[PDB]
Design a protein around this ligand. Structure first.
Ligand SMILES: [Mg+2]
Ligand SMILES: [Mg+2]
Length: 275
């Protein structure tokens, strides 16, 4: 289906993860992966495997939008181990061809709850089960809740109550994870500082389709891109389309693959307890 081309060493500053289609052509995971994998099955770009810490996401401003590691004041970012969790507690990522339009300014986020740990840059199909709406100091932050359609138990999951039923504690832990991530203190002062509520599958799909329409406007130049890189190699109706062979130079000009990988700071091991 899709595959990955990794440039430079993982957890280095130059590390990039580009996506390739069935034919070895470089494509943007933002723009060139269809939102739908099949009827009622959404594509998901996996950005971080469950239980990892590196904060890696689609580069919304880089040509071909490769996955790369976030950087804060010159240092590569890792999420904290929030006791009792190890790193991210879901496969975490995004639905391609969507754009929370400002809004967070990138593809709509997905928490994927299935049993398989997915790889960085892996493209999976997911069944949308619901959506977590969070108020973070007034702003709206959406997290789709989904499960790998290839999960052995996928047939048992069709709405958010199924998550409550067959994975007790998962939704609570999700809210807790995001609350302690956003308010490192622990508890916010009121529902403006942090609020959380889950909505069902139909609501989630309405939100997703809305962000897909916003993306449609983005890649057809009907809305200010606000710095988003819209270069793509497959969208026939997009003025930002570029010849695939021309786009290969974007990858080939970067350091070659090196899978003798940089070691992760020991500080990432530390576990932070809520007091
Ligand atoms: Mg988003
Ligand atoms: Mg986001």
């Amino acid at each position: 289906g899709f595959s990955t081309e990794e440039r430079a060493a993982p957890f280095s500053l130059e590390y990039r993860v580009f996506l390739k289609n069935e034919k070895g052509q470089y494509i943007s995971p933002f723009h060139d992966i269809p939102i739908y994998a099949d009827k009622d099955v959404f594509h998901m770009v996996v950005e971080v495997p469950r239980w990892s810490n590196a904060k890696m996401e689609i580069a919304t401003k880089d040509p071909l939008n490769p996955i790369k590691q976030d950087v804060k004041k010159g240092k590569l970012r890792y999420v904290a181990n929030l006791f009792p969790y190890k790193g991210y507690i879901w496969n975490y990522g995004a639905i391609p061809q969507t754009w929370e339009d400002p809004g967070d300014n990138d593809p709509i986020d997905v928490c994927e709850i299935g049993s398989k740990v997915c790889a960085r840059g892996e493209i999976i199909g997911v069944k949308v089960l619901g959506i977590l709406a969070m108020i973070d100091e007034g702003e709206t932050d959406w997290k789709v809740i989904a499960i790998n359609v290839d999960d052995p138990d996928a047939a048992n999951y069709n709405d958010i109550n199924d998550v409550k039923r067959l994975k007790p504690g998962y939704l609570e832990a999700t809210v807790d994870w995001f609350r302690r991530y956003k308010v490192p203190d622990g508890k916010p002062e009121n529902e403006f500082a942090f609020n959380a509520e889950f909505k069902d599958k139909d609501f989630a799909i309405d939100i997703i389709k809305s962000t897909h329409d916003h993306w449609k406007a983005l890649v057809t130049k009907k809305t200010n891109g606000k710095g988003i890189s819209c270069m793509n190699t497959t969208l026939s109706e997009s003025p930002f389309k570029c010849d695939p062979d021309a786009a290969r130079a974007i990858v080939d000009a970067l350091p070659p693959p090196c899978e003798s990988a940089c070691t992760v700071p020991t500080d990432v091991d530390k576990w932070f307890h809520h007091q």
